[PDB]
Symmetry: D2
Amino acid sequence: FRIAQDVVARENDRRASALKEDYEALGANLARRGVDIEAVTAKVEKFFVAVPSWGVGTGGTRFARFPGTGEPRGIFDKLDDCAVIQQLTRATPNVSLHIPWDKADPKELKARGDALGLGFDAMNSNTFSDAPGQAHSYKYGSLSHTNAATRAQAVEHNLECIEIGKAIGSKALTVWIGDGSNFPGQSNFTRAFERYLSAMAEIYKGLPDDWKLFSEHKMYEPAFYSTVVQDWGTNYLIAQTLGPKAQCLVDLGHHAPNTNIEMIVARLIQFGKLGGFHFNDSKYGDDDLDAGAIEPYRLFLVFNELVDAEARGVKGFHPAHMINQSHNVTDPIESLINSANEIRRAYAQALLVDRAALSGYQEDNDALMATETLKRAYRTDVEPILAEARRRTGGAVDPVATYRASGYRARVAAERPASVA
Amino acid sequence: EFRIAQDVVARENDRRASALKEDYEALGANLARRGVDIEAVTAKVEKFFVAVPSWGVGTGGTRFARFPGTGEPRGIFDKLDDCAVIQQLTRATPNVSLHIPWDKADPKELKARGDALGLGFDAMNSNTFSDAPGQAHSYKYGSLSHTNAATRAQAVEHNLECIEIGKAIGSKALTVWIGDGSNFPGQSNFTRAFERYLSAMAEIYKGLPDDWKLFSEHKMYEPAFYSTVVQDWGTNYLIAQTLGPKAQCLVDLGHHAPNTNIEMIVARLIQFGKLGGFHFNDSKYGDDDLDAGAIEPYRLFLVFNELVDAEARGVKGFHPAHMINQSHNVTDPIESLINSANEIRRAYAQALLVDRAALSGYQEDNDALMATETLKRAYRTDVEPILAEARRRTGGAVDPVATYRASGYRARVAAERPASVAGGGGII
Amino acid sequence: EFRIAQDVVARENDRRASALKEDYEALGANLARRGVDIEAVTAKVEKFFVAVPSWGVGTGGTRFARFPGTGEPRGIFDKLDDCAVIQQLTRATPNVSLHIPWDKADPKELKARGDALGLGFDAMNSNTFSDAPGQAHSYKYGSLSHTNAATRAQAVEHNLECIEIGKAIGSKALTVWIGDGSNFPGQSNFTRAFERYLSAMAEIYKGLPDDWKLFSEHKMYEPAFYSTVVQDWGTNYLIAQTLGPKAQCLVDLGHHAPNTNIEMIVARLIQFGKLGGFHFNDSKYGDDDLDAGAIEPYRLFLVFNELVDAEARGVKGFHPAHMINQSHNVTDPIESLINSANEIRRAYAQALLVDRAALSGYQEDNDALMATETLKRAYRTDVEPILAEARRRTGGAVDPVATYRASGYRARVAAERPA
Amino acid sequence: FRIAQDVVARENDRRASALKEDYEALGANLARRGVDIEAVTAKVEKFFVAVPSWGVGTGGTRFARFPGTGEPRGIFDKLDDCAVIQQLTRATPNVSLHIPWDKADPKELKARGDALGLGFDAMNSNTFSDAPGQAHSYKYGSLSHTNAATRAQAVEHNLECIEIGKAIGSKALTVWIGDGSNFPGQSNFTRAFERYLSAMAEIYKGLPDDWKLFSEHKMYEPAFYSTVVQDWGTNYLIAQTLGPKAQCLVDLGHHAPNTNIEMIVARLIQFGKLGGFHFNDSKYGDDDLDAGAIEPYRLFLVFNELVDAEARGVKGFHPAHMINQSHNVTDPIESLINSANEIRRAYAQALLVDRAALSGYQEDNDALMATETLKRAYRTDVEPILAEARRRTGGAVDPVATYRASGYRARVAAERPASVA
Ligand SMILES: OC[C@H]1O[C@@](O)(CO)[C@H](O)[C@@H]1O
Ligand SMILES: OC[C@H]1O[C@@](O)(CO)[C@H](O)[C@@H]1O
Ligand SMILES: OC[C@H]1O[C@@](O)(CO)[C@H](O)[C@@H]1O
Ligand SMILES: OC[C@H]1O[C@@](O)(CO)[C@H](O)[C@@H]1O
Ligand SMILES: [Mn+2]
Ligand SMILES: [Mn+2]
Ligand SMILES: [Mn+2]
Ligand SMILES: [Mn+2]
Ligand SMILES: [Mn+2]
Ligand SMILES: [Mn+2]
Ligand SMILES: [Mn+2]
Ligand SMILES: [Mn+2]
């Protein structure tokens, strides 16, 4: 146990009275609205989102990085920290790895995961940066590089990621690359995309029968003029071209200003290509902020599309969910905790939507009542539900308060040496 | 017929002939030093055409107000007469695009007037984003994707009627742009609305002749301010792919999100054979509908760079339907359309100057600087002499607007047509 | 008088009274646990008012079309009658904002009708962004900043006329929003046009009563699509500062560039004493004019957070004018305004819940996570019971739209008014 | 000379004939337009823009940095490369320094500058990153940090930058900080700004009589929710509050999408607070791409406002122009060369605008002809003017071509050790 059980119990007891009052009050209010709070709590306690191994360390920008104390020294320390997030929130049982950052003996990774009670989600390849001993640089691209040998090298890297994933329990590979151009004319849009498609086809051939390949679009950064996989339109063409095992990953902060992201989600679901999500929040660009910290309603609206899919009876719909954020000015563990909480919060509210009433208002084109129907769900403070779900599953009623009460950060700060060079 | 007296055209051409010859010869020499035959460029420019919107020769407005000018066209016939001026002077707009019901009239007459004016008819445009007098079902909450079956049927019928009018006048395509969408979260179920849209478009597709095309046009927002069914090229692609070989996508420059790389969308659609055509205009904030190239000329060039790259790589079966789609709120509509058509040919001509072999080399070598400089060498070239010479050699005007103003046309039609009144927009 | 039958209000209130009592008491206990007196919050909420736009009572439209509903108001008097319903049910919109010349009519009759309906009048709104019948000079190329002196003079005169009408009905402010700008580079000389605008506004300020305020409203674009004279808050501040103590800036939520941090603009103006007022609405793309809070409710809360913080910091003489400015294109204008007024009070109420002492501590300690969580604890709170009780206690409806629909008001006016 | 004189002469003679033809042809066309090409050329050869010392090194993003060969390390290597840009373009005689990056003995710096034929422009302070041994971290801010000691440290740093500048010939201090927040509530907008103003007042007090203090606004990055100096409105408030010696710096890529930047320039000029403009281009965010490579007309429109003011000589109008870009996929020197070229190109074209005709069309509200009057100047290919100006002043007809013919990059590659072969 990363966090002492007596600490969790103590903090849970300190807040048990208040939780009871709020939960029972919300329960009665929901009952009057025709909703069974127990049914919602039962679903909420089973909603999981993967935690990025690279998210437990402090992030930075191209201008600077300001590390905190006890930064994880490697993947094993990172898994130890991810275990804290899972123990306290019980919403992050799985971790997403990034290769080569997390490269290590698969048997050891697996052993450590099992020991901490953590599993592994989709693998993430890295051909947007150069690793030591690389025969070819990814400066001008990787999977879509003009140089055949460079693409070949990138393909082999992704295949290696699949080999690592198979050994630790992963069932998917997420591919995000920086490929694109910074100047008009630098790249031939079509030829670069064709090159990408050919390389991804090779990677697709390396997929086990029960695996999935997720391509992730991004409007810009690191490429500032054009990006090969720039939006969901190109992403759909990729997935449709590759095959049944290929789907699209939607990262909230990767879209043009004012984009209606929830519609993109609906469109991908309709055509069965919604592979998964990368949750985070933003205001300007790919800010990678704590999910829901900026626009909680938008997050709720994305979940509204996910829940509606269930209501509509969409088959075989199991999108992969992962948090993909950068924590530059907070304790990474605390931000991941509250971010996981916001995601469950939006999910819970989406479950409260009176779909029967909504379908009626949609058919009668009663726009005002249709939107108010969504608002009645979103406006509901579901914190008591999230807290109870945690209490029942061995988590903390107030995760961050319990984390702080445990003195974990100070503990690891004394155990881990900060990098000097 | 000649809306503009030939003597005025000749007079104004001779007046600038000397200067033109000097500039054309200078550019010709420079291009020769660059291994380019100015004549080959001029020859292609003379043959580049862009359709003019019948509704573009009238003064436009916003939801706040409309400030009509003098001699506003009363209907399609006055509009065709004004369009004839644009074609006569620029020689770049031989075809007009009709919008129904605005331009509803006897097909025979339209065709007859067009032939007399030397104008053809491009893509037909349907209108289910507004209600017409005596209309049975309102399009307030949608049309082709409306929840009410009867409303969708009515919209479908309207589009089929547009195809019937087009066949009678020589058109070979239908362009479908609707305002369908929602202003509030929850108001519409994104998927169901799209399913309804797809089903209705399928019915319209069934009414297409074997040599016709059906163009769906995406738009991020307006009139819908929360979600729009056909919101972007992604949804538009799904539409074209689902409907069939005769269905393609139309790209309107000002219908994209801020900072969108529009030239890439063009390339992607060309790659998958779904680039039906373009709707030219410029913008800075939203769907501003400004004069093409008046705000970002380089972007217009970059879009044409993609068009010429395909046109040069022998991309078979590549005949995108180009059209100007603008709103002229503070200029004489005819003058704006004239210079807009000019800017479009300008971007086209400059795209033709690009050393494709050199560019390809720099792309393969990842020489980003030289690759971008290769495009700039073409873009920086002032091709106005080629544009002016092309017009002169084809019966047009060296300086179209100067000739237009010298003719006194606006004053003339102003005397022939009834006066208009300014007013507010649909805001209230 | 009462637009909505008093028996319908009592009926629809009694129908929901039991549930409200349960929700209000539960919220009261929760807030009590948080050291907050729910009664204190409700008291402030029932005192929060926002003006309703006369031009928002009718169905709005776009440059593509207008789809009116039934019983559309024929003029300002019908609009006042409809505004009376909004106030009767929400009790949050006692004042109406007029727009001249759209609402031109005998000022004396307007006041009389207002007094009879229990409505007051907020800031007057001038209109030199469209031409009126018989107008000598067109505003096509601008108004207060038009190159033609006679046109600027005419625009100034119109604004003074707006002040005359306002003085007769009890208005104490003039809001000036114009479309002046250019659609093409070179069309206007940015600086000279602004110099002309400043000179014309100086004339208006000269004729401004000493018990009145003058609000200039910035907008990034529309109707001008290349440049706009009063394009942002920076230019707006220069205007207010140049004109004088009685001149301030009006912030319309949908008038800023994509991704702009609007709440910061609000803070900056307060700090320099130039925040005159707000035009509330919501949006996603441009100046969409949608129901307030319908798209981004947190942003609305964050704007009010700055307003409540101004009081907490001890800023003096801060009494911003609040006004709804929306276009209802696909809903019953009355229902949208009702729920919009409600959303504004909702954001206000939540801002009142922020533990200022705790927040200040987290800010001083740079505890970003707890600071944001402190705002969230307030924002996540469902204050609907407070809003409903406030309405109930002041003669309004527990559920405004439900009571409105039960009254059959729309069908009624649909029969009294043309098609 | 960094570049051999014989190479410059050789590459000039190779292009002299064609240049003669083009220059004469343009001179004739301009003559028919009532314009004297010589008057334009004389002004162009005198238009200078400062080159950033940090611009000659290869740039990167938060994801990766792909260095090229012969990367300059330290201010001395950088000055050596900056000299190349000045010798070939003759448009960048002054270099802008950044402290503590370019820290060195002032006398030695001044000596190296004089030897290379380079002067020194505005000094640039750095409190957006932590230097080793630093007593207080700038993680949560600098000049506006809540901690008094931290603000004092940032103030002292800025004063030290002025001291360094006074010793090498600089006459201004540019202050751009990352200060802001990533979460609502994290900062109190007003108190943070009050702290900033108070700290800047302390810096202002240390300014010599002939020095200027430039504050730079930026919408976002590194702060992703709010930034203290977020736009020109706040920037104007700062300059007006501080005093006559304080002005605002406008960086093209630091504005919200669709912003009309040329108007901001005009407004600042009208109120005498336009301190300078930092050139670069962009399409998405603060891309820091080569000036005019994405939107050359916008660059021309900015210069239209500058030239209109330069013609009349407005009070307080004496801009301190600098290039501020990041070269992630090109030879930094080549990009800086062509960027300086684009800046002079836009300046030259603005010089061609018929102000009298323009003024007329503006007064008559003839929008079409007004915009056409600007286009007639913009559509003019002034390359012959830029090339001749360089030829007459000791520069190269075709800078990049001459640069590549000299083999300079290969030369420094052999003198400077890369991290890896
Ligand atoms: O942290 C880098 C990750 O961020 C991205 O979203 C790119 O910004 C990709 O998913 C990468 O894996
Ligand atoms: O005038 C409306 C036209 O504008 C559009 O671009 C919609 O904005 C469509 O093409 C319509 O046909
Ligand atoms: O309805 C027009 C109003 O909208 C505006 O916000 C302009 O868009 C102004 O405030 C006007 O008064
Ligand atoms: O390289 C960092 C420079 O970039 C900036 O524009 C910040 O983006 C500032 O001017 C800094 O000096
Ligand atoms: Mn991602
Ligand atoms: Mn990302
Ligand atoms: Mn269009
Ligand atoms: Mn359009
Ligand atoms: Mn407004
Ligand atoms: Mn508005
Ligand atoms: Mn800068
Ligand atoms: Mn910058």
